[PDB]
Amino acid sequence: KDSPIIEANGTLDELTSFIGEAKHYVDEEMKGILEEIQNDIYKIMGEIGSKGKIEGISEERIAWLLKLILRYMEMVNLKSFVLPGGTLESAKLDVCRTIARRALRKVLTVTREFGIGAEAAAYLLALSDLLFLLARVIEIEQG
Amino acid sequence: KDSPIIEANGTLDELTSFIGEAKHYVDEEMKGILEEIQNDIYKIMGEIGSKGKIEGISEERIAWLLKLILRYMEMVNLKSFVLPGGTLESAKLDVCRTIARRALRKVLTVTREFGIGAEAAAYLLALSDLLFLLARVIEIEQG
Amino acid sequence: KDSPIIEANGTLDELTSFIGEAKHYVDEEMKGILEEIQNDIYKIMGEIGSKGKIEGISEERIAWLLKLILRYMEMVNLKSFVLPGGTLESAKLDVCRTIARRALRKVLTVTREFGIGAEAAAYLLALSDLLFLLARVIEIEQGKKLLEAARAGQDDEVRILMANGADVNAADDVGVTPLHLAAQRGHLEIVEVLLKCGADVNAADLWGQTPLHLAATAGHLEIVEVLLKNGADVNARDNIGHTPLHLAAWAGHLEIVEVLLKYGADVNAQDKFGKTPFDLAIDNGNEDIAEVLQKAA
Amino acid sequence: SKGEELFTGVVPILVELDGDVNGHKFSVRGEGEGDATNGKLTLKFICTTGKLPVPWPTLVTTLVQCFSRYPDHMKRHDFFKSAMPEGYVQERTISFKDDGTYKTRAEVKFEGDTLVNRIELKGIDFKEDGNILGHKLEYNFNSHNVYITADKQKNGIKANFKIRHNVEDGSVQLADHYQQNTPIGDGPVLLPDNHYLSTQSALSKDPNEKRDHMVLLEFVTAAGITHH
Amino acid sequence: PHLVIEATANLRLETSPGELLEQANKALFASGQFGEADIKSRFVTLEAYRQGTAAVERAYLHACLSILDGRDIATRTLLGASLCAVLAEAVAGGGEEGVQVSVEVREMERLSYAKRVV
Amino acid sequence: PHLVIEATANLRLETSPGELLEQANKALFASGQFGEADIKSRFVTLEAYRQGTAAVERAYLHACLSILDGRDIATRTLLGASLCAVLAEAVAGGGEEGVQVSVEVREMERLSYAKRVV
Amino acid sequence: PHLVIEATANLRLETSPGELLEQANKALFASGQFGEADIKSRFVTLEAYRQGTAAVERAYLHACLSILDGRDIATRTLLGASLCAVLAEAVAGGGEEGVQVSVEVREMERLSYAKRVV
């Protein structure tokens, strides 16, 4: 009921909506990844909505993102600053990334007030680093 | 000119933009509904921009949404948590819904400061319950 | 590291993402404009991220936007409040505009705290006035194609353009509606499908004419019957004062005079010259149209 | 035959005038379209050099008689269309009563799909505070008859008529017109029996136009030949 | 909105002094802040002037825009950058070296400002 | 108190430019705020001017009163409303439509203001 | 730094109007605040003017120094006292009694001030 708890749920509900808008433009493999990221954002909304009285995500899940980041970070050959939206499909995943950075700043205020959702904010920080790699893999698969 | 009045108009102008982006993916019947919702959001922006010196929406309009919610709430058979964005069209209306909850939280700060726009914030609360039903009717019409 | 600096970079990074989503729906010209606006938002993020220790944009850039705003502001003829998202393409640029107003309010807090990024916030204020003009130019470009398709007489291409949200009441410089050109050229199904969407039946051009006027003087009976079934003024007057009955008696088509007469045509009327339609029928010497018009009077 | 067929639909029109009256030079450009079958036309003219030194109504007759409605029984008398697309030269002497005179020379011809009227006008001996240079003419126009006769020796035609311009104080300014038309091309043209054109003009303004301008609607019908 | 444009005497303009004011009023009205009839501008040509202590001959141009207060710093900064680009393009040159153009934007007070239409 | 009155060139006044200044100094001294000899006023006639973007011919009058600060908003508002009624009654007319009169009241800063009597 | 010097028509100066400006620019540049080439000054001679309500004939001199803000009150007070001593020594006399010299120092705003060099 506090102001920081209601803003934090409002943005995590706005994040999981763009991911549902953006998973219809990707292929079949990344669509299985983006469906398992929406389930995890629905768990985080319970941990934060109840002020911790419900279990949030386990640490087995933050170890699941880091398996993926190390798998795509090899495919992506890093380069200089490249403007977002190379293709239409990779432009949808660059909108989802910048929402996950705004959700990270809201969940990170709940942590510095109520001491809860520290392992949730570590999930949104690894998430927004994954959505940056999924956006640059699509551009290369088109190249 | 105050900080709460300018934020409240900034989000209601951002809400009525997504509804214009999302009314090209729906059919002809719901398009007549979504065009009459944009006219009503343009009235609310005058009530809040002038700090009440202009008439906002009447109560005849909040009685118009509630006719619709009771009409669709019969078509939609409620179920367990279903992830947003079943189809592409119903994914556009789930982005518009989560903007209307963010506009509700801004208009509701104007109310708890300047005592204005109480019957406006009651329009954005009924609106975001309608956009949730319009999103679940489209999925069923596809099913 | 301060709270106002991190929020300001978070929104400028969210702004330059929507512009990348919205530059795939525009044409090749505006795509060259929207690519040079993304480079400039990437400069502003360096000025604000480093708290000024890096050079931001020059003033040569705020003078570049203002060249564009003065070029499109002539093409766009301003009108009353029109709802965002006329077409699908112009709906994408109205989402980008409302993000640029939210970025302006964040950059403008950094200015009122740290005294930096004053010429950046003047770039985002000129930007959001440019994205409003680029959004209203696209609808117009869509609306001129409806006039061209109405003059071409295309059955399916008019419905294709109408299903994408082009305006039914888009006017030219001479003030003509697509209903005017459709009734003039003689394509009945185009008048039907334009009236089904809600085109204004009694629009006036710069000469004061009406779709019933051109439909009467063009000799197409079906468009007269359809327009009179849908609520056209039977006694509309042009700049001189000719009724549909006046031009109908002038052109020598008897059956359209019968069709005008069935729905209540004024025979007792006059023009600015002073002539009744019976007088213009007598002046030409057609005996039959002088006999039918006088007997019903 | 090949001439009249160019006018069976709606035809785009361009008008261009270069003028000099009492040493005051000006230019007018006009654009619109014509429906010769019905003899109805619409044009909008703009003064491209600022404010006109003469009243718009004095230029109406100078600023395309090929758009006249010639009814079927008079088709053999339509000189104007028969000269197309090569066109004709139209020369006029316009004498304003108790005032100056206009001399005009125009070429009326197709340039591509567009009917073009390109005019040179010279005015002399006008009075400084007369009805013309003093801008005392009402912004309206009366109906007139244009009397045409064949000029066989010149394989062309002549016309005479008198224009009546309403003056703001209720008086009438007469403008006597003499006209001659000769084909531009070397091909044969129709040379008509005596007849006349009945003309009506409606002048208006464009509410969105900031430049000095004239909006014009005109209907033209040929008569003066008994029907059978 | 009052616009006072002060140019030295040796400054050569691309255009006439009267045409410089029409271009400067269209650049202020194109910002959407001001009414159409409320934009009032005036041009003044200096006679006795000095710039700096050096013996170099110089020329300069200056414009002071006075607008009623109640506007944020983003609007005022865009009015200075919009006019400075209109003035700098009307300057052909003058003196022995570069011309300096500058535009100030100051706020009148809204409460004590009286206005009437005769 | 400095009073700068700027009128366009086509503006016709009921009186001469010098008599307009005597009436405007009696209206400032009648407010009891200012000394008698400290009221200094000057009249300037503009040559190159433009109002609005329309081709309509117009005229305007403007006065800027500069007073040392330290006075409340009730005194400053009464000085603008006292002069605007003096100027508006001296304007006969000009241009093709109504004349606009306006009076600004601005505060000089009292600490940094230096004054001497030779 | 803009320096606007406004003298009445009957005021007699020790020097020419052009030499008064060279002395006033050396007194501003000697304060070490301003660049050498950024000191711009102009001299204006009034025609219609009135001081006070009395019939006594008077003359006055006034200078308004506009400097960008961000300077403390000790620097602004020293710029008013440095110029007022330059102007008061150039006044020979005028009118029927003492000449009044005054110098205002006002701050332009630094963010909205645009400057370019053609």
Numbering used by the authors:
A (entry chain T), B (entry chain S): 23 to 165
C (entry chain R): 23 to 319
D (entry chain A): 2 to 64, 68 to 232
E (entry chain N), F (entry chain O), G (entry chain X): 2 to 119
Which sentences from the paper describe this structure?
Our scaffolding system uses a DARPin (Designed Ankyrin Repeat Protein) as an adaptor component that is genetically fused by a continuous alpha helical connection to a central core comprised of a designed symmetric protein cage with cubic symmetry (12 orientations in symmetry T). With these ideas put together, our scaffold presents multiple symmetrically disposed copies of an adaptor protein whose sequence can be mutated to bind diverse cargo proteins for imaging.
After mutating the modular scaffold in order to bind green fluorescent protein (GFP), cryo-EM analysis is able to reveal structural details of the cargo protein. Our current study employed the superfolder variant (sfGFP)22 with a V206A mutation. Finally, to convert the scaffold to a form that would bind GFP—and thus illustrating the modularity of the system—we exchanged the amino acid sequences in the binding loops on the original DARP14 scaffold with a sequence known as 3G12419,20. After expanding the particles by T symmetry and subtracting away the density corresponding to 11 of the 12 DARPin adaptors and their bound GFP molecules, the remaining density was classified again in 3D without alignment. Three classes had good density for the DARPin and the bound GFP components, with slight differences in orientation for the distinct classes. We performed two sequential masked refinements on particles from class 1, followed by a multi-body refinement. The multibody refinement searched the DARPin and GFP orientation locally while being constrained by its position relative to the symmetric core. The local resolution for the DARPin has a median value of 3.55 Å (with a 1st to 3rd quartile range of 3.3–4.05 Å). The local resolution for the bound GFP has a median value of 3.8 Å (with a 1st to 3rd quartile range of 3.55–5.55 Å). The alpha helical segment passing through the center of the β-barrel exhibits a local resolution of 3.5 Å, with side chain and fluorophore features clearly visible in the sharpened density map.
